């Protein structure tokens, strides 16, 4: 059970840790989050009370180092930092715990939600999508654009998601134009799975990361990437049986977790209607189709 201490909380802020969130008052004696489950990536995220614009936050894994949060009054945000002195850090955390100035990661024993949302998400893959090699943790916010959004403007601050474009030479073999456009199996299986991702676990990890950035930061380019990766599978006639079964579980937990009030901006009507009712895989996503039909029948 790991800890992310906070130096202080000088500005009023809503703090998220994974799917949980807490309101902290200006100068409230708040000194961080304890009992964070080892074995998963996590995201600690912020929304200032005075600017409900720019949700921002940090992907981290407590196995990779000792991380803390400290407010920077110059840049005007809560920053993640690494403490390299093990004994200084252990001594900071023990003091804050003794004074009970930390919130406990409020996991219910029965509840596999976070595992289910992050099953394939790896910190080493996050750090290739979000390039800042001097830190072990990754900053994401509401406004960061994707490599694909940029092609169509600061490269250092981009989300380097794998570019997926159904009307591209990468997607369409010369001489198999109609076949490759109507059945994307060669683009999914040869180009993306064998070629770029190497395996379905890395593909699902990027899909799951894109969804979480869409949900937690309202990151529009992330939402585009999540839908493109769903549509590429659903639009392939030839998908391994284990990948379809796994995709159904992945999407079920994403739809289950999505705030009911954000379905209008976070769910693309065309993609979901095509995936559940018209695509090759219209009959392969039983759990997803059932939760979507019961939770969001308007969209469909």
């Amino acid at each position: 059970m790991n800890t992310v201490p906070f130096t202080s909380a000088p500005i009023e802020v809503t703090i998220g840790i994974d799917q949980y969130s807490f309101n902290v008052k200006e100068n409230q004696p708040f000194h961080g989050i304890k009992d964070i489950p080892i074995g998963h990536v996590h995201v600690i995220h912020f929304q200032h009370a005075d600017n409900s614009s720019m949700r921002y936050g940090y992907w981290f894994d407590c196995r990779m180092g000792n991380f803390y949060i400290q407010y920077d009054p110059k840049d005007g945000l809560y920053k993640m930092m690494e403490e390299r002195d093990g004994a200084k850090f252990e001594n900071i955390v023990h003091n804050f715990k003794e004074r009970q100035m930390m919130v406990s990661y409020p996991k219910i024993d029965e509840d596999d939600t976070w595992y289910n949302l992050t099953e394939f998400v790896q910190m080493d893959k996050i750090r290739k999508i979000v390039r800042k090699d001097e830190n072990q943790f990754s900053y994401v916010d509401s406004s960061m654009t994707t490599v694909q959004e940029n092609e169509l403007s600061d490269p250092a601050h981009s989300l380097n998601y794998t570019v997926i474009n159904f009307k591209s030479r990468e997607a369409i073999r010369p001489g198999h134009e109609m076949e490759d456009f109507l059945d994307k199996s060669y683009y999914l299986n040869t180009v993306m799975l064998q070629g770029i991702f190497k395996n379905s676990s890395n593909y699902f990890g990027e899909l799951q990361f894109a969804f979480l950035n869409a949900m937690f930061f309202g990151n529009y380019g992330s939402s585009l990437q999540w839908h493109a990766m769903i549509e590429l599978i659903c639009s392939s006639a030839t998908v391994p049986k284990h990948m379809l079964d796994k995709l159904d579980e992945i999407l079920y937990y994403q739809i289950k977790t999505l705030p009911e009030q954000y379905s209008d901006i976070l769910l693309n009507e065309r993609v979901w209607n095509i995936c559940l009712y018209s695509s090759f895989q219209k009959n392969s996503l039983h759990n997803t189709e059932k939760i979507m039909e019961n939770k969001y029948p308007e969209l469909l």
């Binding site: 009307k167 591209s168 030479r169 369409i172 010369p174 134009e177 109609m178 456009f181």
Partner: protein, 237 residues
């Protein structure tokens, strides 16, 4: 974006462009079977690929053999159209390749875009114009070369005959769209109007009769009258 009434003069500028109409690619007769079910029998079709500035028509004849053993033919017909248009562009010298291709039906956009990925600087556009190119098979010499074809064939025509010696591309296109609109609305009537006077013939190397400038004004008036009448009947107005 879409070609409309607003940007109509763009058709007659010096940027090479082609219209592509796929209406007549996949053509069938519907009939009863011995068992009283319904079946189709394909007949020869054509792609209608037209340079509106020059009148050059690239009539690619679609022989029924291309459908043999294929499924979902109305879908395949859009892809076969895009394949043949792509092949035509690749066959042209670089300085003759179009800068834009305008498709008369929006369902041709994705097929043509995907076949033309090698030509990222050729713009594929839809149109808001309701163009009457479906009536191309009412031009006797075009219908005749399509129906007689025993294999895939490309035939080159000038759909304006020699009109550009006397009139502008804008006026030539307006005459062509009026003739085809008449032929589409009431073929029998349109064809009677065009041939009623036997002294006016079609040259061996032409599609339309050899009207004087004064005869074209009479003809064009007869075609407008035909179209308006038919409109009153269609809508009881």
């Amino acid at each position: 974006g879409a070609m409309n009434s607003s940007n109509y003069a763009e058709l007659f500028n010096n940027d090479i462009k082609l219209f592509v109409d796929d209406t007549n690619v996949y053509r069938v007769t519907v009939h009863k079977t011995f068992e009283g079910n319904v079946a189709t029998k394909a007949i020869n079709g054509c792609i209608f690929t037209l340079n509106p500035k020059t009148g050059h028509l690239f009539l690619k004849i679609i022989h029924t053999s291309v459908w043999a053993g294929q499924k979902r033919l109305s879908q395949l017909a859009k892809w076969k159209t895009a394949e043949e248009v792509s092949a035509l562009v690749r066959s042209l010298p670089k300085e003759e390749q179009p800068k834009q291709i305008i498709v008369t039906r929006k369902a041709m956009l994705d097929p043509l875009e995907v076949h033309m990925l090698d030509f990222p600087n050729i713009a594929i556009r839809p149109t808001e114009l309701r163009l009457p190119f479906s009536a191309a098979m009412s031009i006797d010499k075009l219908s005749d070369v399509v129906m007689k074809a025993t294999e895939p064939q490309m035939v080159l025509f000038n759909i304006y005959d020699d009109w550009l010696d006397r009139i502008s591309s804008y006026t030539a296109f307006s005459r062509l769209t009026l003739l085809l609109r008449a032929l589409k609305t009431n073929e029998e009537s349109a064809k009677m109007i065009l041939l009623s006077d036997p002294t006016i013939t079609i040259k061996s190397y032409h599609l339309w009769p050899s009207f004087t400038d004064e005869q074209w004004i009479t003809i064009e008036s007869q075609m407008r009258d035909l179209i308006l009448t038919e409109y009153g009947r269609k809508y009881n107005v």
